[PDB]
Design a protein around this ligand. Structure first.
Ligand SMILES: CN1Cc2cc(Br)ccc2NC1=O
Length: 116
């Protein structure tokens, strides 16, 4: 008897965990919109990152019901983190910012998943 989550159920449960990331300043700033390699001056970005992901895209998928299960949402969040850890050097701002967001996320998501 597989459990169905309504889009609205998932938005109500998961969106606050995304808002937790949005709220982190300065750490969220590089994550709030799609990476634009040209504006940023990193033209090898899409050479290396083949599945880009960012907060605004995750928000939009919640807002349009594109996640059928909570793990799909969590996977997109980790996708965004894994892209940043892959592309950026360990000493960089964005790498360290990513690690800060990942710590915040883990603390926020665990209770929500138990609830779901
Ligand atoms: C997610 N990002 C955002 C970013 C922002 C600036 Br500024 C420089 C490099 C990057 N790379 C990323 O992976």
């Amino acid at each position: 008897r597989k459990k169905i989550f309504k889009p609205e159920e998932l938005r109500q449960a998961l969106m606050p965990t995304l808002e937790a990331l949005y709220r982190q300043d300065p750490e969220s700033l590089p994550f709030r919109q799609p990476v634009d390699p040209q504006l940023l001056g990193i033209p090898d970005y899409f050479d290396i990152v083949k599945n880009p992901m960012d907060l605004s895209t995750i928000k939009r998928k919640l807002d349009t019901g594109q996640y059928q299960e909570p793990w799909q949402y969590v996977d997109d969040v980790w996708l965004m983190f894994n892209n940043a850890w892959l592309y950026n050097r360990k000493t960089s701002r964005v790498y360290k910012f990513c690690s800060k967001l990942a710590e915040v996320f883990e603390q926020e998501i665990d209770p929500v998943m138990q609830s779901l």
